[PDB]
Design an enzyme around this catalytic site. Structure first.
Site, mmCIF file in Angstrom:
data_model
loop_
_atom_site.group_PDB
_atom_site.id
_atom_site.type_symbol
_atom_site.label_atom_id
_atom_site.label_comp_id
_atom_site.label_asym_id
_atom_site.label_seq_id
_atom_site.Cartn_x
_atom_site.Cartn_y
_atom_site.Cartn_z
ATOM 1 C CE1 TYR A 140 0.810 0.968 4.416
ATOM 2 C CE2 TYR A 140 0.607 -1.144 4.395
ATOM 3 C CZ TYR A 140 1.275 -0.158 5.133
ATOM 4 O OH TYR A 140 1.954 -0.395 6.336
ATOM 5 C CB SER A 153 2.132 -3.032 16.545
ATOM 6 O OG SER A 153 0.895 -2.777 16.678
ATOM 7 N N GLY A 154 1.326 0.664 15.214
ATOM 8 C CA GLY A 154 0.885 0.290 13.907
ATOM 9 C C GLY A 154 -0.540 0.243 13.334
ATOM 10 C CG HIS A 158 -7.508 4.737 8.665
ATOM 11 N ND1 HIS A 158 -7.849 4.817 7.351
ATOM 12 C CD2 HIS A 158 -6.285 4.293 8.894
ATOM 13 C CE1 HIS A 158 -7.706 3.660 6.394
ATOM 14 N NE2 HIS A 158 -6.524 2.845 7.762
ATOM 15 C CG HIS A 163 -0.201 -2.786 10.082
ATOM 16 N ND1 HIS A 163 0.514 -4.215 9.984
ATOM 17 C CD2 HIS A 163 0.112 -2.398 10.794
ATOM 18 C CE1 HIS A 163 1.767 -3.890 10.258
ATOM 19 N NE2 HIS A 163 1.228 -2.506 11.271
ATOM 20 C CB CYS A 165 -5.420 -0.323 9.922
ATOM 21 S SG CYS A 165 -3.705 -0.603 10.490
ATOM 22 C CG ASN A 167 -11.895 1.882 5.682
ATOM 23 O OD1 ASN A 167 -11.186 2.807 5.594
ATOM 24 N ND2 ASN A 167 -12.032 1.716 4.566
#
Length: 190
Positions: A140, A153-154, A158, A163, A165, A167
């Site tokens: 990405y 860890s990131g 958002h 990862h 993450c 969304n």
């Protein structure tokens, strides 16, 4: 030592201070109803066991130095991997239960208990920065909007997201960002 002075935080926010059991004894947390916790390890943190109490003043004494902070509202957002949701509640009542994309069927968001670490209006995310080609399926180059960090860890607040993450929609991710302060509890569950 973190939290810093006066800092208005949330109720999953750790106490963080930089023989482990030796320095574990020179640390004590003074709370109105003697809030308990445990330790976690250099750098050790003390975390309250059933969140904090809301709007409670917290005192931290470590050696000859003692610093304090106040908690605001209790805002909790829960990310259910079965239902594909990120539910947000503020003091008891759910405000907005928003549909969330928590990673992808390869690397879904890691189930666990966290706080809101940071608020970044737009943050650019480049996988080349730690070794992943952009032609990789986990590769990405993106500018995230309304980014609330979940982990060191990131992982971020958002769709085939990487990862692990989380969304949200632009309209939904805006509200969580405006409503959130650091420390605000973050729970990933089933």
């Amino acid at each position: 030592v973190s939290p810093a002075n006066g800092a208005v935080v949330g109720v999953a926010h750790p106490v963080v201070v930089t023989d482990r059991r030796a320095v574990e004894r020179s640390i004590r947390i003074s709370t109105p109803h003697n809030t308990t916790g445990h330790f976690e390890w250099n750098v050790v943190r003390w975390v309250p066991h059933r969140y904090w109490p809301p709007h409670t003043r917290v005192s931290v004494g470590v050696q000859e130095l003692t610093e304090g902070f106040e908690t605001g509202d209790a805002l909790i957002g829960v990310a259910s991997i079965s239902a594909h949701t990120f539910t947000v509640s503020r003091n008891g009542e759910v405000l907005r239960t928003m549909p969330a994309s928590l990673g992808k069927p390869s690397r879904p968001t890691p189930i666990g208990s966290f706080h809101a670490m940071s608020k970044e209006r737009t943050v650019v995310m480049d996988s080349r920065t730690i070794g992943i080609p952009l032609n990789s399926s986990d590769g990405y180059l993106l500018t995230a909007h309304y980014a609330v960090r979940v982990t060191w860890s990131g992982v971020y607040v958002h769709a085939n997201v990487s990862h692990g993450c989380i969304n949200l929609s632009p309209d939904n991710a805006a509200w969580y960002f405006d409503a959130v302060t650091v420390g605000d509890p973050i729970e990933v569950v089933g």
